[PDB]
């Protein structure tokens, strides 16, 4: 059978990590304290999964687009997959460069099946730690293929909600993601790993704030899958 992506190419693939911590004063966006902890954790976690990791810090929206364009124009024929990690401010459908916003659609389109042929039929993973709006979760006590196929978006939070980051320990989502990848990459299919990430973020984290509006809030991550096969990081 062929229910799983071929992951035994000579290379696992690129892991591009865009780490935006400091923003242009004119944007009025706050510094993302704790994001370096996230970036270092993802670097180490994906290095051990045998990805070629490229860390990028504090990119403008222009730099983000050009980087994605360039990476998409690379020959990935010897690569099993592609991973892109986005750490920034955001809103619905949007990620922030240091000087202003970027359509998530614009970035991901570069990797469409018809636009990056050396990635066609291969899993393209986008991992996004950024807000998707301003809602807060109060909680409750207990032969052609489509050009959009083979994408997976691991969002940190539900549609329309804030996403939480701790200035000391890093973002809830990324710390949980890394720990689950470390413990389970040699054992579970990726969807099942991300379900455990969901549970850990949902159960183990709750906000502490002096501001009643922001206190005692919860978060649930959002897996969006257009994959056509099971994904195992091992072979």
């Amino acid at each position: 059978l062929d229910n799983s992506y071929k992951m035994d190419y000579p290379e696992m693939g690129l892991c591009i990590i865009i780490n935006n911590k400091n923003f242009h004063k004119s944007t009025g966006m706050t510094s993302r304290s704790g994001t370096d902890v996230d970036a270092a954790n993802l670097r180490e976690t994906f290095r051990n999964l045998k990805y070629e990791v490229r860390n990028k810090n504090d990119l403008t929206r222009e730099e983000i687009v050009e980087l994605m364009r360039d990476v998409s124009k690379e020959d990935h024929s010897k690569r099993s997959s592609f991973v892109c990690v986005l750490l920034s401010h955001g809103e619905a459908g949007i990620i922030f460069g240091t000087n202003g916003p970027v359509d998530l659609k614009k970035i991901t389109n570069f990797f469409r099946g018809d636009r990056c042929r050396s990635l066609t039929g291969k899993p393209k993973l986008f991992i996004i730690q950024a807000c998707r709006g301003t809602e807060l979760d109060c909680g409750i006590e207990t032969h052609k293929i489509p050009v959009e196929a083979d994408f997976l978006y691991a969002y940190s939070t539900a549609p329309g909600y804030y996403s939480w980051r701790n200035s000391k320990d890093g973002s809830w989502f990324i710390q949980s993601l890394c720990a689950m990848l470390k413990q389970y990459a040699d054992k579970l299919e990726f969807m099942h790993i991300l379900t455990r990430v969901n549970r850990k973020v949902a159960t183990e984290f709750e906000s502490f704030s002096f501001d009643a509006t922001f206190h005692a809030k919860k978060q649930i991550p959002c897996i969006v899958s257009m994959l056509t096969k099971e994904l195992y990081f091992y072979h």
């Binding site: 950024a130 939480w164 973002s171």
Partner: peptide, 4 residues
Amino acid sequence: DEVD
């Protein structure tokens, strides 16, 4: 804790 802070929001993104």
